[PDB]
Structure 1
């Protein structure tokens, strides 16, 4: 099919035990991504792609988040987490105020071809780096409701 699904969280830089970033593998179940701790200032989570393919459109739901960046890369080599290419810079969906109880505390957004670099999006990748950014928590953890990709 002309879609892209996740397999497992290859790399991660912000995930808890029960609500770990691996919960993103089950976008339709009963668990989402939640930073390993509270004080959601900036969390990173690199997920793997069940198959190396290109990227034409992406889907990510914000769970009290505000900025969401996504990088692309392949499992080739795998020396450091800096051998990726900025597929789509951080996307601002919410703010650090409505995430509490002033406005939409949760919203889901997506990306297409215009939001992805053509020089890289058309390159077959099989790894993705998702990094959320925005200081909205302090005692309770949070992050994304789910993450998806589609060619």
Structure 2
């Protein structure tokens, strides 16, 4: 089918144990991504793609976060974690107001072709870096509710 399927969280730069970014592999079920600690200032998590393909559209939902940047890359070289190109800059869906007056605490958004670079989106990648950004917590963690890529 013309879609994208994740395999496992290749890299993790903000994931806990019980509620880890690997829960993104199970969008439905009943678990999402949660930073490894509280004080959600910025969290990063690279997910692996079950197949190297091009990216034309994406559907990721924010779980209290506000800024969401996504980079693209392949398994080439190996655990480099430094050879990805900014497919789509950080997307601002919410802000630190939701963390104050529940102003839409849980929202979601997608990234079609207009939100992805054509010089890279059309390149077959198999690894993606997901980074959320917005200082809103301190004692409790948080992150994203789900991530769904689609070619």
TM-score range relative to shorter protein: over 0.9
CA distance in 2: counterparts of 1:27 and 1:143, whole angstroms: 14
- Tell whether the 8 Å contact from 1:8 to 1:47 is kept in structure 2 after alignment: yes
The alpha-carbon deviation at position 102 of structure 1 amounts to 3.3
Partner SS state of residue 119, structure 2: helix
CA distance in 2: counterparts of 1:77 and 1:140, whole angstroms: 37
- Tell whether the 8 Å contact from 1:61 to 1:145 is kept in structure 2 after alignment: yes
Q: Which one is further off, 127-136 or 96-105?
A: 96-105
CA distance in 2: counterparts of 1:31 and 1:88, whole angstroms: 25
Judging changes above 3 Å, is the alpha-carbon distance between structure 1 residues 83 and 42 closer, same or farther for their aligned structure 2 residues?
same
Is 1:90 aligned to residue 90 of structure 2? yes
Query: Which 4+ runs in 1 deviate beyond 3 A?
Result: 99-102
Superposed CA offset, 1:32-88 (max 9, x none): 000000000000000000000000001110000000000000001125212000000
For normalisation by structure 1, the TM-score amounts to 0.98
Partner SS state of residue 69, structure 2: strand
Partner SS state of residue 71, structure 1: strand
Q: Which one is further off, 72-81 or 88-97?
A: 72-81
> Which residues of structure 1 form unaligned runs of 5+?
none
CA distance in 2: counterparts of 1:128 and 1:102, whole angstroms: 30
RMSD: 0.9
Superposed CA offset, 1:106-142 (max 9, x none): 1011100000000000000000000000001111000
Partner SS state of residue 51, structure 2: strand
The alpha-carbon deviation at position 31 of structure 1 amounts to 0.2
For normalisation by structure 2, the TM-score amounts to 0.98
CA distance in 2: counterparts of 1:127 and 1:39, whole angstroms: 27
CA distance in 2: counterparts of 1:12 and 1:83, whole angstroms: 16
- Tell whether the 8 Å contact from 1:46 to 1:129 is kept in structure 2 after alignment: yes
